[PDB]
């Protein structure tokens, strides 16, 4: 239907607007703490811990396959990677650390990406 096509036209700009989103909220770790899935092989008491664990080349699988219907679903995954080190790690580590500047530094990119979210529709 002409319908569907249209809902899957909006899909693809939210993916477009999503992986911008990323990119930028990626930019805010410089040290790639949170790049890849923490390694099973090198913690593996992980699970044990942390049930649901995040990381951007997860967030960049399903964003290109079209996964995130909405901002929300998209935001979740990322707070996710942050709330996920702040319970495994102590504050007194440089993981902590990186998880704290990368939340207060993303809140500002995601603020403006929630009004362009409602703006363009």
Known sequence: SMEQVAMELRLTELTRLLRSVLD??????????????????????????????????????????????NLHEFEEDFDLIIDNCMKYNARD???????????????????????EVDSIG
């Open 93 to 115: 580590t440089v993981f902590y650390r990186a998880a704290v500047r990368l939340r207060d530094q993303g809140g500002v990119v995601l603020r403006q990406a929630r009004r």
């Open 24 to 69: 930028q909220l990626q930019d805010k770790d410089p040290a790639r703490i949170f790049a890849q899935p923490v390694s099973l092989k090198e913690v593996p008491d992980y699970l044990d811990h942390i049930k649901h664990p995040m990381d951007f080349a997860t967030m960049r699988k399903r964003l290109e396959a079209q996964g995130y219907k």
